[PDB]
Scaffold this active site. Structure first.
Site, short mmCIF file in Angstrom:
data_model
loop_
_atom_site.label_atom_id
_atom_site.label_comp_id
_atom_site.label_asym_id
_atom_site.label_seq_id
_atom_site.Cartn_x
_atom_site.Cartn_y
_atom_site.Cartn_z
N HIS A 41 0.79 -1.35 -0.08
CA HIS A 41 0.00 0.08 0.21
C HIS A 41 0.75 1.22 0.13
O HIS A 41 0.19 2.36 -0.08
CB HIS A 41 -1.09 -0.15 1.20
CG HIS A 41 -0.29 0.29 2.58
ND1 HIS A 41 -0.43 -0.88 3.42
CD2 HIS A 41 0.03 1.32 3.19
CE1 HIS A 41 0.22 -0.47 4.78
NE2 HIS A 41 0.07 0.79 4.67
N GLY A 143 3.03 5.83 10.02
CA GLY A 143 4.50 5.54 9.58
C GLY A 143 4.96 4.51 10.16
O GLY A 143 6.05 4.04 9.76
N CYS A 145 4.10 1.28 9.17
CA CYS A 145 4.14 0.10 8.54
C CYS A 145 5.18 -0.32 7.83
O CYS A 145 6.10 0.57 7.59
CB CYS A 145 3.18 0.54 7.40
SG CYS A 145 1.18 0.35 8.11
#
Ligand SMILES: *[C@@H](O)[C@H](C[C@@H]1CCNC1=O)NC(=O)[C@H](CC(C)C)NC(=O)OCC(C)(C)[S@@](=O)c1ccccc1
Lengths: 301, 299
Positions: A41, A143, A145
């Site tokens: 993503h 932030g 991920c």
């Protein structure tokens, strides 16, 4: 109690963290040999995140749209591909700090260390257990991920988790390093919900073995049970049924104490059915379910 | 809400193994000096009343074997600073981080890198107890493991491990070799003073529980600082100072709950208990998160 959550030392993983940016979206990636792994993503705008068509979004992308950085230093991307929910970015430099590693898909109950990272920079390390509903109780901000979960065996880092999302109830979901989600989650900014959770029976049994090792054994009874009878009772108390693999991973603690696994199950069954009756185990009236049999051996020996 | 340790890589690159006679423990290798507990030089018949200056003067550089991985480091000199031995070696550690040595205050938290035979094994968060013990996880061979905090790129070392007490808690020194607490590096059973609960940290953790939507223990009431401190002292909680109230300001603003309002809620918990409920998963009031810890993790 004498027990605590203990993470593995994080340095070998710290040496693999980078940042990956597509547009203004920055998350973390894992740099091993000449490949960087990160959540797919990263290619999504906030608009795409609602109902992304990942295959179509990826077609529009080229190597030169990915900004990979170790610190301030750009790593040139020379190839890209998607594997389930992870993006693989081929880079032109092999990571000199690559450890011996492998990619492992864990089962519920297994614990691992999380190296929480932001903009490629490690912030903290802590231990998580994979819940039976395939969520973890992380501590993850925007932030985070692409932060990874891992275990270390000798010199070898087994990567088992990469972080992708937070759920309504504050718990977290993610994939293995082949991009396959744990649990029935999808990487879409859509309303999703964690299943009802259950207690990790194999870890409670590890905890009771730990108590015995430390001389706290009032709860040992003279009886035994079959695995099937125990599983059927346990489910009535929102405990997970045991697998053959669970029985096997309790082998070492069973051998260390001389208490057969099915005898310990009968003791746990009595605790479930009769309660603690005011007593404590390892100093608590609550049974702990986030220490695996390996965690116990590590801290007892 | 997670007890979170600092990433340990900068400290891992400093850990080495130190052997003297039949005793092995860990050392900390910074630039060309290895720091370790001085009791490494003690034999069995020494440990009960070791005259350390006397035992050290009888040692040679070659009595100390230092290993970094598969590599032996040649000891070219040694000195003692209080309860730490400083071994000068002929090689600089290129992995030496930016660092300082600090002596922490009771109530402050730090990460521990537990090591065995010079090899890092686990990392976890600890607090300096009011009675100057630490509730660690340390086994045989863990001595010389260090505790630290990280600020930007700078490692502040605050703890080196030396001993376990009969109650299962732990004692050690700062990196100048001075013990925290009234303990002594001799092989004797030592008791600590009566421990107390770190009140400012309990309050920080209650604010953490609110920030994560857990607010059943709140009440409408308020208290004065002094009345709260009378109750705290009764329950073997440390005094709350005005500096503590100020330190708690940011968490106060974030939740809109005045510090003395949260004190009144804690007073109720102390008097009434939790009634079987839990806060942030715990059946007990947790006192090893500082205000800074909570803020840094909720930010
Ligand atoms: C590191 O060398 C080691 C770490 C200990 C070992 C077990 N857990 C730890 O944290 N330090 C020691 O073994 C230490 C060495 C002296 C300072 C020279 N001694 C120590 O911690 O002794 C523990 C006692 C509980 C004192 S046990 O040895 C004892 C002694 C006398 C009477 C009863 C019990």
């Amino acid at each position: 109690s004498g027990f605590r959550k203990m993470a593995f030392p994080s340095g070998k993983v710290e040496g693999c963290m980078v940042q990956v940016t597509c547009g203004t979206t920055t998350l973390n990636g894992l740099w091993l040999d000449d490949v960087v792994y990160c959540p797919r993503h990263v290619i999504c705008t906030s608009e795409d995140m609602l109902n992304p068509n990942y295959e179509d979004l990826l077609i529009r992308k080229s190597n030169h749209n990915f900004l990979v950085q170790a610190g301030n230093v750009q790593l040139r991307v020379i190839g890209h591909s998607m594997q389930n929910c992870v993006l693989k970015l081929k880079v032109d430099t092999a990571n000199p700090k690559t450890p011996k590693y492998k990619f492992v898909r864990i089962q519920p109950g297994q614990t691992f260390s999380v190296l929480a990272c932001y903009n490629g920079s490690p912030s903290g390390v802590y231990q998580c257990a994979m819940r039976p509903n395939f969520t973890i109780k992380g501590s993850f901000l925007n932030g985070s991920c692409g932060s990874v979960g891992f275990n270390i065996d000798y010199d070898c880092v087994s990567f088992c988790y990469m972080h992708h999302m937070e759920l309504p109830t504050g718990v977290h979901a993610g994939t293995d390093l082949e991009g396959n989600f744990y649990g029935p989650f999808v990487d879409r900014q859509t309303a999703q919900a964690a299943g009802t959770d259950t207690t990790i029976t194999v870890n409670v049994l590890a905890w009771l073995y730990a108590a015995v090792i430390n001389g706290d054994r009032w709860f040992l009874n003279r009886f035994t049970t079959t695995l099937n009878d125990f599983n059927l009772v346990a489910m009535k108390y929102n405990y997970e049924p045991l697998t053959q693999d669970h029985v096997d991973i309790l082998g070492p603690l069973s051998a260390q104490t001389g208490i057969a696994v099915l005898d310990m199950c009968a003791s746990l069954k009595e605790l479930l059915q009769n309660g603690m009756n005011g007593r404590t185990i390892l100093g608590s009236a609550l049974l702990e379910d986030e220490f695996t049999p390996f965690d116990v051996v590590r801290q007892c020996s």
